[PDB]
Amino acid sequence: TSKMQKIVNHRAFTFTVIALILFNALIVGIETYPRIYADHKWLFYRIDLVLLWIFTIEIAMRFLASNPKSAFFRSSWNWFDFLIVAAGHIFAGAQFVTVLRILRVLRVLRAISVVPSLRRLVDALVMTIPALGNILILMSIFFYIFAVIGTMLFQHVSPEYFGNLQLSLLTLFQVVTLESWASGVMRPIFAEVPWSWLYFVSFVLIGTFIIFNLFIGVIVNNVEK
Amino acid sequence: TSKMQKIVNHRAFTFTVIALILFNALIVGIETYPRIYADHKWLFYRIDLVLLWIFTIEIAMRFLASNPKSAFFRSSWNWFDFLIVAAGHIFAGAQFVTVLRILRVLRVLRAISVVPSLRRLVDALVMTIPALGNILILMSIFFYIFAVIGTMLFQHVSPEYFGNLQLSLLTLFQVVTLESWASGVMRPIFAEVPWSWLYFVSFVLIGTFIIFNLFIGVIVNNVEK
Amino acid sequence: TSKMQKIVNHRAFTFTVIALILFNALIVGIETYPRIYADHKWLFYRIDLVLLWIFTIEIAMRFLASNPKSAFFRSSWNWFDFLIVAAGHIFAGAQFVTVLRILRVLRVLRAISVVPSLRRLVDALVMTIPALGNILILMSIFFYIFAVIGTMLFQHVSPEYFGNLQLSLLTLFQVVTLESWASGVMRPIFAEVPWSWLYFVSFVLIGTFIIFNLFIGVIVNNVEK
Amino acid sequence: TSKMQKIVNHRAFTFTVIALILFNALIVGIETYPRIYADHKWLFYRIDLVLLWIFTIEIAMRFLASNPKSAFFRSSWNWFDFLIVAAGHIFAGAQFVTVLRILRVLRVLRAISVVPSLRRLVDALVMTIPALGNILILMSIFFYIFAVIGTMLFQHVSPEYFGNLQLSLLTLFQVVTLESWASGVMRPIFAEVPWSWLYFVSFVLIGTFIIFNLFIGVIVNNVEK
Ligand SMILES: CCCCCCCC/C=C/CCCCCCCC(=O)O[C@@H](COC(=O)CCCCCCCCCCCCCCC)COP(=O)([O-])OCC[N+](C)(C)C
Ligand SMILES: CCCCCCCC/C=C/CCCCCCCC(=O)O[C@@H](COC(=O)CCCCCCCCCCCCCCC)COP(=O)([O-])OCC[N+](C)(C)C
Ligand SMILES: CCCCCCCC/C=C/CCCCCCCC(=O)O[C@@H](COC(=O)CCCCCCCCCCCCCCC)COP(=O)([O-])OCC[N+](C)(C)C
Ligand SMILES: CCCCCCCC/C=C/CCCCCCCC(=O)O[C@@H](COC(=O)CCCCCCCCCCCCCCC)COP(=O)([O-])OCC[N+](C)(C)C
Ligand SMILES: CCCCCCCC/C=C\CCCCCCCC(=O)O[C@@H](COC(=O)CCCCCCCCCCCCCCC)COP(=O)([O-])OCC[N+](C)(C)C
Ligand SMILES: CCCCCCCC/C=C\CCCCCCCC(=O)O[C@@H](COC(=O)CCCCCCCCCCCCCCC)COP(=O)([O-])OCC[N+](C)(C)C
Ligand SMILES: CCCCCCCC/C=C\CCCCCCCC(=O)O[C@@H](COC(=O)CCCCCCCCCCCCCCC)COP(=O)([O-])OCC[N+](C)(C)C
Ligand SMILES: CCCCCCCC/C=C\CCCCCCCC(=O)O[C@@H](COC(=O)CCCCCCCCCCCCCCC)COP(=O)([O-])OCC[N+](C)(C)C
């Protein structure tokens, strides 16, 4: 006999949870200002515990609502919720007492999993990755090649941008979004070594040609089916 | 008996209205220069009243031309016209005597509602919003998350850009159009805190990936039907 | 009897003309350097006249080759050729003796009309304009509105960018290609008047939303037929 | 009798080669840092020879594995491999002893030819060029025209950007990716000669209109078939 999971299904529960999420966003936004936060700090304390208490129980409900002896964690969107809320308790007295603030902020992000028409949208929007999941390998290969060619040439011409392999990856990420690829990056270097342009004029091309076929390949297969 | 709304329909009337609109644009453009305006101020006065008088009557015509006891205001494009022209009279002697100038400028904008092939174009171009009216919610959620994560980290590292929640929204709007996201925004901060790049390199990605599916989603459904 | 326009049709003639065009490009490029030009000026003179003489006759041929008593000028691509080459002679001794240089440069541009697969490409690529020939009117209206709203507000806050109606059109053209719309244009102004952002944050949106439907509208009708 | 090319076909061989490629990438990346390289230089030497020895033999295998008396070099992707690896030996004692380093870096690039689903992807991604292989000619013609018009006007107004035909090509490449086309390039010049804007406002248009039809033309034919 099990009179627990019979009418355990609810409808207006989602409105409760979304109101809680929006109230948490409104709470944590206010925490940003310094003068308001110090003065109202006493009031806020009881609230974080209160909000945390409100969440945990409402995910334990879902835990003991849909066949606990089943794929509750084999599914997605539930492992995620549990990870966030449980980290909520685990980092409550962590030596790093401040990551709790960032995670409290990140809490609201579950508002895409508790409402329909968002869960479905992000589900499709992420399942589309393995479609273009091949050109990414190409834009990694042609990315590392230049990231490691540049750093051995322009290492003593401009240590700021091309200082080292991991610091020269950031620059070749700046130059592929076409952001000051001629005011800060190229021109000062090009003023020193004369044949350097063949490295930027051949990266803003062979690099914008893949970001282009990314678009085309995700626009063809996403239309055909 | 009603011999009013029988031949009240007109054809060349639209040419009168469009000539008036273009003349109003030409009038208000000249108002910009200071030397010309002060000298010709006496001449201009009689004109604003004259143009205002010309409009009001020609919208009252439409008011008493197509079944006044019907959906004259339940429709759109008429509520808009009436709002603009009536604000014309309401702000004529407002304590704010200068908003009348901006609204006089904005008057010409009705040139999209008085001519065909523009009304239809803007009608479709705005009705397409509820199609992508879902990804906007996602680009608001993932927007607020970073807008409130950044402001609590980089609040005492660069008060100019990330000074406060409402002043840090503008910056994260600058960095999503890829405008000086490495010359002004990132590099000075990144020179202070070392692991900050994971916040910009993970916003120019997870933020240009939604502006991308915006494009794709509005290019698929706008082709299929 | 007319034994002129019988075998007047030619095949290898196009190779002669394209070789002449490429040689003219190679000639005029060299003219750019100053040291080379002064020294070789004597040699160059005989060449411009020689090239000009070579052209004129080869367009007079076409004039008297395909039914001169027909639509030789009602067609396009011939009126263009004749205009360029005839300007060649007309500006030979013009009071402006230097526009002849720019027009000599522009001469090579006819290389798109004398070779196939380019004439056809540019023909289609320009005939596509009346398709989107409607959104352009909208991007002119919403362009003038802001171009004349901005100049009356920010006329004594930054005369460089928003100095006058014709000088403020250039700025609102800069801000619609998303080029330093927050480093040079907005931020200095926004530091003076506080509520100014509502003018740039509402132009980089309602202005990139039309440049977007430009793309979509020219990608739908250019696929459907 | 030929008992050589009977069971010469292999399967796990590709895993050997890809492990070698990844190990070469990991080896050459470390070479970038200076302190690590000098100290570990003795260890590295034996490795370059070892890796080089490992490659050469494994391409000679393929040479004598698939009908050497056939189109081994008439094919592609094999001429490329052989060119790279053979340059490996040819530049081993070159007067330029340092290009060997860059070529050692470039060695890893063959990781797109030794694994499937990459060879096919790059094959299609390059075979698509002759489709748009016509608009490129147009974007070369309209490119040279402005590249040689600008250099004769703005040669004594700003020698930095428009110094000469080959140095003014770089600038008109900067201005077509819309990168500081109003902060560095235009505004300083435009402050000197007044009617110069008609050269940049008519290049950022007639130049972004071809990069646009590039997109459209490669999105239509790449969908239709
Ligand atoms: C199918 C085939 C795929 C091919 C993919 C190829 C991948 C192959 C992967 C190759 C691995 C890369 C080799 C780097 C190893 C360096 C180790 C090191 O010395 O650390 C140095 C510190 O500095 C760092 O550790 C920087 C951390 C690495 C930054 C990024 C490395 C990988 C990124 C690659 C981008 C990948 C994708 C990018 C685009 C998304 C230590 O030196 P030091 O600082 O002087 O401190 C003292 C040194 N000491 C310890 C001796 C005392
Ligand atoms: C489906 C779920 C959707 C989720 C959406 C989440 C939305 C949840 C919404 C949450 C609301 C946000 C909380 C902020 C409230 C602050 C109040 C405040 O203190 O004002 C301060 C002034 O400064 C301001 O008032 C700034 C105005 C707000 C800027 C933008 C806020 C909302 C933007 C969010 C972006 C939304 C989208 C953005 C992208 C389009 C007052 O402090 P002070 O200045 O020091 O002056 C003295 C203080 N004193 C009065 C005590 C004396
Ligand atoms: C369907 C409906 C369509 C609606 C379209 C609306 C179009 C309506 C068109 C309206 C016309 C615009 C009105 C401006 C007239 C100013 C005349 C003037 O005073 O000149 C001044 C000089 O300065 C100039 O002349 C600047 C030249 C004009 C710049 C651009 C104007 C039009 C651009 C609009 C952009 C259009 C599209 C833009 C996007 C492509 C003279 O003053 P001054 O310099 O002090 O010199 C002394 C003065 N003095 C002579 C008295 C001694
Ligand atoms: C279907 C039709 C197609 C039409 C296409 C048209 C193509 C027609 C091609 C025309 C050729 C161009 C003419 C330039 C020749 C200059 C020679 C010269 O004087 O060198 C100078 C050096 O400086 C250089 O040599 C610069 C090198 C050339 C840069 C790019 C030239 C071609 C680029 C074009 C872009 C093409 C595409 C661009 C977009 C991809 C020498 O002078 P100096 O430096 O003072 O040194 C002393 C001089 N001295 C030796 C006398 C002592
Ligand atoms: C999700 C985000 C990454 C995405 C995956 C990337 C793979 C992993 C890549 C890198 C991971 C390894 C880096 C570890 C850094 C340790 C050292 C360090 O502190 O960093 C240093 C450098 O900072 C960087 O190197 C940033 C690395 C950028 C990698 C991706 C670039 C864009 C990828 C585009 C991909 C698009 C194509 C599709 C592929 C995605 C900063 O500190 P520092 O070393 O002390 O430097 C001096 C500090 N000081 C100056 C303040 C004094
Ligand atoms: C239609 C336009 C907005 C669109 C809706 C946005 C929602 C509502 C958002 C904000 C509305 C609430 C802000 C109220 C401002 C009051 C205080 C103030 O003066 O502002 C201050 C800051 O200025 C800002 O914060 C600009 C806000 C940007 C919001 C949108 C950013 C891009 C959205 C992209 C969306 C794309 C994705 C799809 C979603 C659209 C300026 O004055 P101050 O505070 O005194 O600062 C110091 C002044 N001083 C330095 C000069 C001394
Ligand atoms: C083909 C190109 C134009 C295209 C048609 C544009 C329509 C006609 C528009 C303008 C034509 C009328 C301007 C006449 C200028 C006379 C005065 C003058 O010298 O100009 C002045 C300003 O320079 C400008 O105003 C540039 C005008 C830009 C117009 C188009 C902007 C982008 C359109 C985007 C369209 C995209 C959407 C679709 C619509 C296309 C410069 O000289 P000055 O006044 O002495 O200023 C001080 C000089 N000093 C500082 C050096 C000391
Ligand atoms: C694969 C990359 C090229 C692509 C083909 C390009 C064709 C061939 C084009 C040029 C080749 C000929 C140039 C030879 C240079 C010799 C002189 C020289 O040193 O260069 C000089 C200039 O540097 C340049 O001129 C760069 C040339 C850019 C050409 C392409 C621009 C973008 C094309 C976009 C195409 C997109 C549309 C589709 C078409 C592709 C640098 O040295 P310098 O002269 O001493 O100058 C002073 C040096 N100092 C200041 C440090 C003191």
The residues spanned by each domain of chain C are 1-115, 116-225
- At residue B69, the 3 state secondary structure works out as coil
Q: Which residues contact D136 (CB under 8 A, 6 or more apart)?
A: none
Assign domain A116-225 to its CATH architecture.
Orthogonal Bundle (1.10)
Tokens standing for C142?
């919403």
Q: Which residues contact B209 (CB under 8 A, 6 or more apart)?
A: none
Nearest to C135 among B121, B177, B223 (CB): B121
B181/A125 Cβ within 8 A? no
Q: Which residues contact A27 (CB under 8 A, 6 or more apart)?
A: A44, A47, A51
Length of chain D: 225
Can you spell out the DSSP letters for D154-173? TTSS-HHHHSSTTHHHHHHH
**Residue written as token pair 């009798």:** D1
Q: Tell whether ligand 7 has an atom less than 6 A from the beta carbon of residue C213.
A: no
Q: How far from each other are the two terminal CA atoms of chain D, in whole angstroms? A: 47
CB contact at 8 A, D124 and D117: no
Q: Which residues contact B24 (CB under 8 A, 6 or more apart)?
A: B51, B104, B107, B108
Shortest alpha-carbon distance between residue D76 and chain A (Å)? 19
Tokens standing for B111?
């040139």
Which residue lies with its CA nearest to atom 14 of ligand 6? Answer: B166
- Residue type at position A7: I
The experimental method, as deposited, was cryo-EM
Q: Tell whether ligand 4 has an atom less than 6 A from the beta carbon of residue C30.
A: yes
CB contact at 8 A, C218 and C128: yes
Chain C residues touching D141 at Cβ < 8 A:
108-109, 111-112
Closest CA to D151 of C30, B32, C171, B53: C30
Helices (H), B154-209: 159-162, 167-174, 186-190, 197-200
CA-based max dimension of chain D: 84
Tokens standing for A61?
């409900």
CB contact at 8 A, D114 and D58: no
Residue to mutate, A132, A166, A208, ligand 5, most ligand atoms under 8 Å from C-beta = A166
Closest CA to C27 of C41, C12, C17, C13: C41
Cβ count within 10 A of residue C207: 19
Q: Which residues contact C13 (CB under 8 A, 6 or more apart)?
A: C58
Q: What would you report as the CA-atom Rg of chain C, rounded to the nearest whole angstrom?
A: 25
**Residue written as token pair 């362009």:** C143
Cα(B197)–Cα(B187) distance, integer angstroms: 9
Resolution (A): 3.7
Q: Which residues contact A30 (CB under 8 A, 6 or more apart)?
A: A36, A37, A40
Cα(D174)–Cα(D207) distance, integer angstroms: 12
Q: Tell whether ligand 2 has an atom less than 6 A from the beta carbon of residue B173.
A: no
The secondary structure element, H or E, covering residue D116 is none
